[PDB]
Amino acid sequence: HMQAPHKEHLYKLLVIGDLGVGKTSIIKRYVHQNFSSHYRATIGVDFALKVLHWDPETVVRLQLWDIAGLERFGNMTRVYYREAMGAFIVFDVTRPATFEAVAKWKNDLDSKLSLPNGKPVSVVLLANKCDQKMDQFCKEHGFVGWFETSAKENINIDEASRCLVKHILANE
Ligand SMILES: Nc1nc2c(ncn2[C@@H]2O[C@H](COP(=O)(O)OP(=O)(O)OP(=O)(O)O)[C@@H](O)[C@H]2O)c(=O)[nH]1
Ligand SMILES: [Mg+2]
């Protein structure tokens, strides 16, 4: 006797934000349980896979697209965004200018990507490096929620991803 296979959801998720805010470190902590203090800049886009045992009958596979910080100044984001179901937009709490870039990334995303029915994709805001007004910002810029995160100390990355996936499931 075999047990029945689990239902599966496969989601391509974007991780965007300006240089050095911690996008790659968030993904590396989430998927590989690892962190590095050395800064190695992403070139173009890198990828990582997260398998989530969502509930006893369900598996969620996340294809994470780790986009480099300078790409909002290029012309590749529309290609990079294609077929994504959700995104994290990231800034660095220690460098407030990176918060000002959050709206630029959000407008870039919303102008180049929408769900098949025309609804904008689910987006969660990550205030990263928290180891070192937000509600109003999320309501005014169309975010489903926000979290203080730390790739170094592993704070709220699991929680923020679960929040994003919950919203994606609810809007399919
Ligand atoms: N203290 C602290 N440092 C962090 C955290 N996350 C990332 N860093 C550091 O911030 C620097 C930049 O991290 P990256 O993950 O490479 O940032 P990025 O957004 O991927 O940068 P680009 O790929 O160039 O756009 C690295 O030195 C990391 O060690 C964090 O949560 N806390
Ligand atoms: Mg990177």
From Swiss-Prot:
It comes from the Eukaryota. GTP binds at residues 20-25, 36-37, 39, 42, 69, 129, 131, 151-152. Keywords: Cell membrane, Cytoplasmic vesicle, GTP-binding, Hydrolase, Lipoprotein, Magnesium, Membrane, Metal-binding, Nucleotide-binding, Palmitate, Prenylation, Protein transport, Transport. Although at least one in vitro system can process and methylate the prenylated C-terminal, in an in vitro system that normally express Rab-38 and in vivo the prenylated C-terminal is not proteolytically processed and not methylated. Its main location: membrane. Gene3D superfamilies: P-loop containing nucleotide triphosphate hydrolases. Regulated by guanine nucleotide exchange factors (GEFs) including the BLOC-3 complex composed of HPS1 and HPS4 which promote the exchange of bound GDP for free GTP. Regulated by GTPase activating proteins (GAPs) including SGSM2 which increase the GTP hydrolysis activity. Inhibited by GDP dissociation inhibitors (GDIs). GO terms for biological process: endosome to melanosome transport; intracellular protein transport; melanosome assembly; melanosome organization; mitochondrion organization; phagosome acidification; platelet dense granule organization; positive regulation of melanin biosynthetic process. Mg(2+) binds at residues 24, 42, 66. Belongs to the small GTPase superfamily. Rab family. Interacts with ANKRD27. This is Ras-related protein Rab-38. The lineage of its organism: Eukaryota, Metazoa, Chordata, Craniata, Vertebrata.
